[PDB]
Amino acid sequence: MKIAIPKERRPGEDRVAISPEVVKKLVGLGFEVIVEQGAGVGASITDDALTAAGATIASTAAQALSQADVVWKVQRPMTAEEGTDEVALIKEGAVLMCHLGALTNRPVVEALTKRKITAYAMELMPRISRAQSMDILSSQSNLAGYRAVIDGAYEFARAFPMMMTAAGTVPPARVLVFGVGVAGLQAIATAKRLGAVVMATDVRAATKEQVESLGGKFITVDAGGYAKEMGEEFRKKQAEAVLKELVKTDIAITTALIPGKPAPVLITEEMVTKMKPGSVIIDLAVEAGGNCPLSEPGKIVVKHGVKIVGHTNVPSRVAADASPLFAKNLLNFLTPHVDKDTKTLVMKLEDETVSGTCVTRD
Amino acid sequence: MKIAIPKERRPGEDRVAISPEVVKKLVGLGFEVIVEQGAGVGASITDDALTAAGATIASTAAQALSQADVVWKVQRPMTAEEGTDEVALIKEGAVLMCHLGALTNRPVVEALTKRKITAYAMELMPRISRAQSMDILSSQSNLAGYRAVIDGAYEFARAFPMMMTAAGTVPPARVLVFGVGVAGLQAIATAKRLGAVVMATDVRAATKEQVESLGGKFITVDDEAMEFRKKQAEAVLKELVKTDIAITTALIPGKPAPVLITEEMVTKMKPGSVIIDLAVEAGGNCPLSEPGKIVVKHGVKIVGHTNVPSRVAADASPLFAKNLLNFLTPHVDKDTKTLVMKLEDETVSGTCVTRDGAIVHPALTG
Amino acid sequence: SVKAGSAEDAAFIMKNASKVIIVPGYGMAVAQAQHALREMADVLKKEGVEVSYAIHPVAGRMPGHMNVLLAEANVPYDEVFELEEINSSFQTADVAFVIGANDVTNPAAKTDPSSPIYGMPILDVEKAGTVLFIKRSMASGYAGVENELFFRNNTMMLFGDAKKMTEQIVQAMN
Ligand SMILES: NC(=O)c1ccc[n+]([C@@H]2O[C@H](COP(=O)([O-])OP(=O)(O)OC[C@H]3O[C@@H](n4cnc5c(N)ncnc54)[C@H](OP(=O)(O)O)[C@@H]3O)[C@@H](O)[C@H]2O)c1
Ligand SMILES: NC(=S)c1ccc[n+]([C@@H]2O[C@H](COP(=O)([O-])OP(=O)(O)OC[C@H]3O[C@@H](n4cnc5c(N)ncnc54)[C@H](O)[C@@H]3O)[C@@H](O)[C@H]2O)c1
């Protein structure tokens, strides 16, 4: 049985669905692993390293999928009309696994359904506690929260930590993070490391506890693992005490998300207008609309003295760490169905880890 | 009397020699403070924010300097030979205070001498316990050490701290700091709080203790214990081969920066690595660095931003305005509002470059 | 000409106070005693005592040297004060726990007009009831001058390492 990992061809993507460590494990399971030459250059994972791990190197992407029984990718294949038929490379009848992005990418789903291709959308993984090791949203969110503080510190013209000096005291940056989920918790941690006083808030009440344990203060207000819309009534009661802290904030990171619905606006243009000049806003929900209407995907926007950052595919900004983890999420999702000496795959299906994910098993 | 703060003209200089907190002091000391418009913008110090402190807002540099008795700047004023005569704007016989770069820029000092301007070069502050609050060399370098880490983090494709996740573990980043002065020390501290394994190396023996007082690990050969020891660079290369981010802070006044990471050495580095050369304006500690840009060779990113202190302009400027004020206050007394620099003071004698129509500092052909 | 003193003693002196302010210095860093030190403070302010840190701009070997190490030990910001914002409080303080700090207290900065540390602002530690130091020996610090505060009526010389000399005090503090 063969498995192939191509180089990511989408604009920006520097991640790759593989690492040396993950090839070793794949090999021991009876898989012949072919990786595309130069595929791990953006993640610092060299060709030399993958071979030593037991895999093989393919000259072209086309050669990589040519005889692939299973294909692993980070981002969804570019459909024929997207500028280069990748779905057309993946050998017919094989299995694909990646952040296909089901829901919003209906076409790519049929192009695969026509090539008699079985694809698994890793971003639809159930929120069950035994799947944390295979959840790509989490492994990437986590890094995104780190990179947010980094990107914030970069764009910020002041230093993060307090330092009492012979020339006077440089006060600590004051950070406020809207949305204390995975990305937000890590944003709090990394921020607390550089010495900033951290402020946070979330609708989910089970948060306040976590925030206080990391070292931050909780801005109190007032599903099966997440939340939904709160109503105009709340949003207004929210910007209440938030104000008190938002007009004293230097870095504001927004990570709020709500499935199937537009990202919740938490900082209006009327609020950014009140932030200290030189402040920075890191909008992580930018690709779901954004938590601040001023943010625009892929670029930094300065408006009213505040810098509003909205990079896209932030996880790729942390490629070398993001990739190993991504490759492992896939390994953890596949490994449980490789019947030990037979070299053949069968997706349980009774196991919701295969059902909640399989979009087209044509 | 009258003191004015112009906007910095040199390209990329975002700092400004003033602050709201310092204006209140200058007024309280008897001065009428004037500052050019848009002067503190790059430093997030608005005119309104400034006026509110007691400052007036002249519209142009000329109008700001015109009749000022004392002048405050960060970088040295430009001469006609550079395309813009700023020393021409300064009133004859006035007093100038700024980072002159005197010992290395005789021309500006001459320009100032022709207009009988008393100039105090802040960079020449005596290294004495009582002038620590008047030292711009350390307040700026300190922020640069901080920023060197932030830039390195920004350019690195991995996170600094080790993370143990449900999906796996990612090792911390390894930082190697070359040169342990004020800057390098703050880099160690910033890299260690961010969660990285930090190694350091400096020529001055007494360093090892400073480095460990920050959780760092000093690079020392163990052929034994504390004829040609020039093979210590084998222990330095041992680490470099495992380093993710190398930050070099070595510099020497007047002289070119000492090469600390050869081209031969960078080839031995792992792909994805970044070298932050804070010594890039004096030639660099790495010959592959280029003033003002991120070059890339052998898979290694060689970052060489200029004027790093300016990359932390909003905190750097108030610190600088503080140094300036701390230097001046001891000379502004009753005397019905008049400053008089006691020639006895070592802070005045070691910093004064030229006095009313005549070069004064020894090291300057006079 | 110099009074001595051990942990047990130092535990006593401080354990019998209502207001205590810590004064960290380079010494506290070389020994990496931030976590020990921060304990001797929360076990101290446990009784109901008030604790504060007097941070001198030039403590350690670089700007913010004391800050970063205290911040790592998790000592609160609103409890750490700069020379100018606390230098007065020493008077109404029984103990002036001086861990690893020396030049930052030497009085030769207001007197002896010829001292390398002359003109430099210092912390009014002596105005404190009893001033407990801490240091491996007698050698001076960066300055290269002796501290007249070392040998005089109200002064302790807990000779040893900052982390250890604090480690034990925390113990004989139970
Ligand atoms: N802040 C800056 O950026 C900077 C830069 C350059 C110079 N300086 C200067 O350095 C001084 C710093 O203030 P400071 O109070 O800390 O003065 P010191 O630096 O003068 O004092 C050091 C104290 O720590 C002790 N010590 C060393 N290792 C120790 C250990 N392992 N355990 C316990 N104690 C230890 C020393 O004595 P033993 O060896 O006898 O134990 C000494 O009493 C000032 O004079 C300042 O101007 C500061
Ligand atoms: N495999 C399993 S079991 C799994 C996987 C991923 C996350 N989780 C859990 O789900 C929770 C969060 O996950 P997530 O990925 O970060 O979610 P997601 O990134 O979608 O949510 C971001 C944050 O937005 C918050 N939020 C949404 N709307 C608002 C609003 N109007 N005001 C304030 N905050 C708002 C929300 O509660 C959450 O904390 C955590 O407690 C995790 O533990 C479980």
Structure description:
Chain A has 362 residues and is an alpha/beta fold. Chain A folds into two domains: 144-317, Rossmann fold, CATH 3.40.50.720; 2-143 and 318-361, 3-Layer(aba) Sandwich (Rossmann fold), CATH 3.40.50.720. Chain A contains twelve helices and 16 strands. In chain A, the strands form three sheets. A seven-stranded mixed sheet of chain A has the order 3-2-1-4-5-6-16, with helices on both faces. Chain A has a seven-stranded mixed sheet with strand order 11-10-9-12-13-15-14. In chain A, α5 (136-155) runs antiparallel to α11 (319-334). Chain A is elongated and about 65 Å long. Chain C has 174 residues and is of the alpha/beta class. In chain C, α1 packs across α6 and α3 packs parallel to α6. The longest helix of chain C has 10 residues, at 162-171. Chain C is globular and about 45 Å long. The chains are: A alpha/beta (362), C alpha/beta (174). The complex binds NADP nicotinamide-adenine-dinucleotide phosphate and thionicotinamide-adenine-dinucleotide (SND).
Q: Please count the helical segments of chain C.
A: 6
Q: What is the CATH topology classification name of the largest domain in chain A?
A: Rossmann fold
Number of domains of chain A: 2
Biggest interface reads: A-B, 48 and 48 residues
* SSE string of chain A, helices as H and strands as E: EHEHEHEEHEHEEEHEHEHHEHEEEHHE
Secondary structure class of chain A reads alpha/beta
What's the story with the biggest beta sheet of chain C?
Answer: 4 strands, parallel
Task: Give the CATH architecture of the largest domain in chain A.
Answer: 3-Layer(aba) Sandwich
Instruction: Quote the beta fraction of chain A.
Output: 15-25%
| Percent helix of chain A | 25-40%
Structural class of chain C: alpha/beta
